[PDB]
Amino acid sequence: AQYKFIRRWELQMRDEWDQLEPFKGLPKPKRQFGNEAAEVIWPYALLLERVVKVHPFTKSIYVYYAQRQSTARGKLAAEIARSFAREFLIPITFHNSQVYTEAEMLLEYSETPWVVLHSLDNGQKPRILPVAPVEGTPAHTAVEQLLAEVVQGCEALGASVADPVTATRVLNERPLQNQYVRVDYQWFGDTPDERASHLVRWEFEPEQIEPKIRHRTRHVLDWL
Amino acid sequence: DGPPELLDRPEDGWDGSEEIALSSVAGXXXXXXXXXX
Amino acid sequence: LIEDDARTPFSDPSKSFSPRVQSYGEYVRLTGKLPRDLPVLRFVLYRDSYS
Amino acid sequence: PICPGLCGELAAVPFRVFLGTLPTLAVEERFLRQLQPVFAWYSSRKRVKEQANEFIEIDLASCDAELLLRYSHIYYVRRQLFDELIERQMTLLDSGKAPKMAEPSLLQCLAGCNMTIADRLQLEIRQLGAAKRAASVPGRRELDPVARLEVYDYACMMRLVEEDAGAVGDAEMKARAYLPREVIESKLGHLTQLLLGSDARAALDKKDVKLLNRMIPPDYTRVGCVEKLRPFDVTAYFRFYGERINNVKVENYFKRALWGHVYRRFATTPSFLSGVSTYWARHSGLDASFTTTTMPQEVAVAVCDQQIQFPAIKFRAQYVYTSPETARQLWRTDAAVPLMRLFPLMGSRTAEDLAAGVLTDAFWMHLGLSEEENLLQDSLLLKVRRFVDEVGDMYETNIDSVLKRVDDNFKQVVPQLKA
Amino acid sequence: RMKEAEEEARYMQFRKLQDTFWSNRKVLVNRVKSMYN
Amino acid sequence: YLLNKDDVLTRVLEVVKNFEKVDASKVTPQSHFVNDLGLNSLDVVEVVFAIEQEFILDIPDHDAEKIQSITDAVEYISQNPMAK
Amino acid sequence: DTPGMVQGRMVEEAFRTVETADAAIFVTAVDEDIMPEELSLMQYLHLKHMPVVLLANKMDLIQEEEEEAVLDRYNSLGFGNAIPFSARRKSGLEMLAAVLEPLYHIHAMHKVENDWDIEDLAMQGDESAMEEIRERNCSDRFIRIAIVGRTNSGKSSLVNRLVGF
Amino acid sequence: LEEKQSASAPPLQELVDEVQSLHVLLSSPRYEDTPLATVERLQCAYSEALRCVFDRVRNASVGKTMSCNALLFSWSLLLQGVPALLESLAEKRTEECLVRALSTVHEALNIVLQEFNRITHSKERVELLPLEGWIESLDVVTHPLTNKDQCKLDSATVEFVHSRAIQAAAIRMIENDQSDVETEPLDPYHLYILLRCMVRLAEKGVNDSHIHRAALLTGMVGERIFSSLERTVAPPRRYSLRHALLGKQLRDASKPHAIPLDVCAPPGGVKKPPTAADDVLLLTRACTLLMKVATNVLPQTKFKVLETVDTVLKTLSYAPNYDLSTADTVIFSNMVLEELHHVDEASATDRHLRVLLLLSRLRLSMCADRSALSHLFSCLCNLLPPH
Amino acid sequence: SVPSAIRIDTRVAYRRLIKVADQVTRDCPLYQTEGLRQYVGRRFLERAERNRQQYRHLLHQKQRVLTAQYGKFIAKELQQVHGLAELLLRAPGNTALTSMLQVLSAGVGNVHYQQTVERNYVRYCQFEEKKLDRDEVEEEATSDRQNRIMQH
């Protein structure tokens, strides 16, 4: 029995590594029925193709859509919200690093999906924007229209902050939110320095630049 | 097509003994302000 | 913190440093509580060649 | 689902439902596939994790037990739930040793009703037995559809037969989409003010609101979502609100039950439901292009026929609780679904509930208010007022004529099986 | 400059106490001027 | 010589309210330990023993098996002269 | 002292030493979150039916406000009431001593009871029991044999062959 | 939490509140270090507010005109501030002015006394006034101002008001009609007033039932205050398991060391106290009055009195030093020492430790009345350690 | 479900066990307020539910002769509970049993750590009982041997 139990342990660990060995240092995302875009391994090529910039004072973007729809335009709006959540939610958080993006599929017969925008100002109520695409406009255009609406709503909600200085303070003190994202850095570089090697890096701190080894001058001469 | 766990699949071959069952059992004062009315 | 050896260069990560005190601290007088009912204080004064 | 809104005050009864073993959570994946309309309740319920097993803590006194028994589709799960309910009710009865007993006169009036119920009982059971052998449909599936039909699966089989009678799929979900809770409460307060000028209270009490929250499954709690109610939940809310808001004295429980069943019928009728319903996005003010403020009449009638169906099973399940001596005999042999929310309202309360329900069903069948139009007519309101007042006064004065009325009205509401 | 204001809060406690002791004697002196005149 | 029923009720009320399984809003001066409070028999043994803690008197086995209601606990301690 | 879990798996030598032990002190650190290899070992120790006590080391890095949420997660990890510990500050040894004290007396009981069983068996005339008692009562000084040499000389394989595994 | 909160999303009363605030600022011990100019300003404001309240009351002169509860609370305030009110109303330092002010106050109190006579003649129900109302009525009917040595007095009225207050206390202690938040049965000030009335009627209130009800009331109040202080200073998570396994034990037995009485957190800051500025003082004085009342009772109720004394003593040990009033605390301590002079078992050790720690805490050189210090000297010279 | 006699017997046993646990928490200092009470209640309720499920399975003249066996089994378990209460009463004198009860009240480790302390408790009491007898018979034997040697 113990032999088969150890074999089971080995197989379980092997599959868990094959799934998460290059992503073991990252936290795990939510296991919701709309957050399938968080467990997939995102190509850095797609992440570079889709670079969305939202207002820095925004903190959360949620996209709620319904599972089943009884109306044709309701099903169309649900598909639009699903496509937007699968296309731009991960790029937004990956390129902003201060916003938390989440999508969810409510198991109900609704025909109007929506998006919720939360700002860094706790004293400011969140905003709700419905997904109401034009029947004549295609899905590829409706997704871009929803993205435009979301970006403009984020801009308005960030500009309508109560105390911009306090908002900047809480932004500077807030940690990173996209630590769960599984990015496959393909031929670009395993390290940010390897990625930006084609550029001159002027932003460095001498405390970290200074080598902290014995005979560091000898080693620097050998390296140079 | 959506979440496969939510997607329904049929059970053509199922064992009566395959069912599993287990039994487990579950294991400030304040001040009173007075206002004359 | 000030070095303990001049032979060891500052580039050595395991260089020893000991603390030397620059100021022992800051002090203020102690002023007790003065009772509302008994403000008058009686005392004895001993002066050696003081006016 | 036998008596919407019929609830009594009792403590919490915890029960741990086994969800499976990590990582092969078979019961949990079956629940994910089946409990889709009650997935909000499922996700809201707490998750307790043992060392190597998974359990969920449900409240047997709350609607959790009945919802699981109705939507389970798992024979051994619902069997364990039914057996635990029966055993805990037996233990509670043996420990209480003193339940309130009804009068022997009214119990004799209800005893003769089962003699006529047993004729349609065999017919309605065959409908439930035939539906079990039709589990090969991709809509609803079961483990052993060829096995013998048992007593605990009655709720699921009744739900399936009601779906087949309505002929509209996901009618409960389509009705929950158009039945928000706040607008339903507002329309119910309006109807209560129309029915009673000063006889109604200003609002409901906190204990009653707590009982309602325990008996109604919760919806999602997102930022933009609103509390939506199923049609059965709206019926239960109407019944509970009326029965708790009428200013009839606590000793005159019969008139309170009559008002409760009147509100239950006002909620079960399709015209009033579609008239008082509105889309959730319109109620919230989010969207103004897909207003669709009116509920689809086809879905409304198809979902009201579900609640209209199966009178005999409900009457039998309530007669089981009408007397404690007969409950010990009919809990393991006769057709009966056990609900912990029926135990605090013992013999007297449930007997008066049965009588009031029979009388209200007969009044509705006689006046034809189920389909005509516009129940808010002042003439119909005054007629209902006079009906409830006369019946309450008669029940207080002379009970023999009331029992004769109950017998005649029972023969009226549930006719004998023909051919 | 925010930490500079935090250092003044430590020493402001002892400046209020010196102003209180001087004002207490001012009140006590005026009481004596009335008891005798 | 005997404790008054008002004081002996406040004590038994405060114990069942501060109990580990009983809710404050569910208890009332006229309530049953099993039906109105929802406690099991092994929990009734605990709440009676908690009453034996504040009232230094010792209750025998037969006289403790009769205390299934809060009013029953009040009547027993009131008639018992050995209560502090 | 056993080696850590490398690549989510403990070496075979460590598994045999853990099985030989009576109890286990699962030492986890607070600077890093709970990792899958820790959960894999926790369930392995559970399936082996061995007493394990959770010890949360490196508590000196925890602030006064975050100690609540940290211990809540450690107590909901299957093992109850994780012991806060700090090896740099040497905090928690008197608290760890109170936990290993019952196991100390239980082992003392099993040892004396086993000695009585072997004594009774040897009085019956069993050679294995008399030989066991002879090795016990033989009170002589241990001979420390150190096997040293150069790297890759095969001394680790030499002791493994001498021991038998 | 963000998801959850987003899913969720000159009146007489003001005059009375101002009078109460100024009185607590002038009488609380932790404000004794206030500057003298501020003390004089607060005292002038308090005198002016009390004069305005008394003027309003004497101009109304009818309970049914304004209120009953408001009138009773206003008269309780005026009674607790009689000397300042008299010095403000007489407007001069003269015996004739004092007599005039006292006569005016007697005239104004005749209204309340006649209202009490009318109520006790009509036999009103206890639902008329709350427990606070009945206690204030008992205070204003038993206050020595009526017999200072021309008012309407009646011992039947006194006994009726006393019985009504006791019945209202019983009702309030048995109702417990709170949903989830637990409140105190009675304010510390009203509890002190009730026990003061019981001290005044000690010749008539020797009833063990009344003494037991009062002891239970003050025990509940002390339990509230102690629970507040304990929630304020509580041991942390890092020491929770250490206390569960070891329990504040020491490495070596005979170090020697100081025996800890209560387990709390290590020093972490200032931890501003939550209790009011006079809660501890009122609790201490009320417990002193309770012990003075129950000095001669049966052992069955004496046990409950001693348990309440132990609860109040624990509350005092938890209370800070600036909130501890030296005079009232030393009075309470010497009374507890007189009680400990009786040979007690299994609790004399901890009681002696509590009392001696509380005595070492405070400053005996700052005590106002020297009679308490002399009695403490006697009690400590006559005190015997446990066996 | 369970007959009234067995219910009354188990209630008396549980009350005795609670009284003994409180007396032990008083006599030997258990530094946690609830202490052994929660653990004892949990274990007792778990065993009671196990035996109730066993009786439910047994419910399915054969039932007449099996109910007597079930009653004898319950009586044996109750005698075990009473002996355990006696051993808890004798614990506060010994310091090892005090440490076992203290660690059980604190509730550290896992089910296997809390079970080896629970099972070996009564075994430790029996071992302390046998140890005195062994030491006494050995000292009497060596005294007789010394007296016999001194005679020659």
Ligand SMILES: *P(=O)(O)OCC(C)(C)[C@@H](O)C(=O)NCCC(=O)NCCSC(=O)CCCCCCCCC
């Ligand atoms: P009530 O009358 O509703 O409860 C009656 C119950 C007990 C529920 C019966 O229905 C029942 O289940 N009876 C049979 C079970 C029974 O009698 N159990 C007695 C327990 S004996 C036992 O083995 C328990 C030992 C636990 C001791 C734990 C040791 C911890 C100390 C460290």
Ligand SMILES: Nc1nc2c(ncn2[C@@H]2O[C@H](COP(=O)(O)OP(=O)(O)OP(=O)(O)O)[C@@H](O)[C@H]2O)c(=O)[nH]1
């Ligand atoms: N802050 C803090 N650091 C500690 C503490 N204990 C150990 N460390 C640090 O953690 C590092 C781990 O040292 P080890 O004892 O070798 O860790 P290990 O468990 O033996 O790990 P491996 O042998 O590599 O499997 C040490 O170098 C210490 O600097 C502690 O209690 N607090």
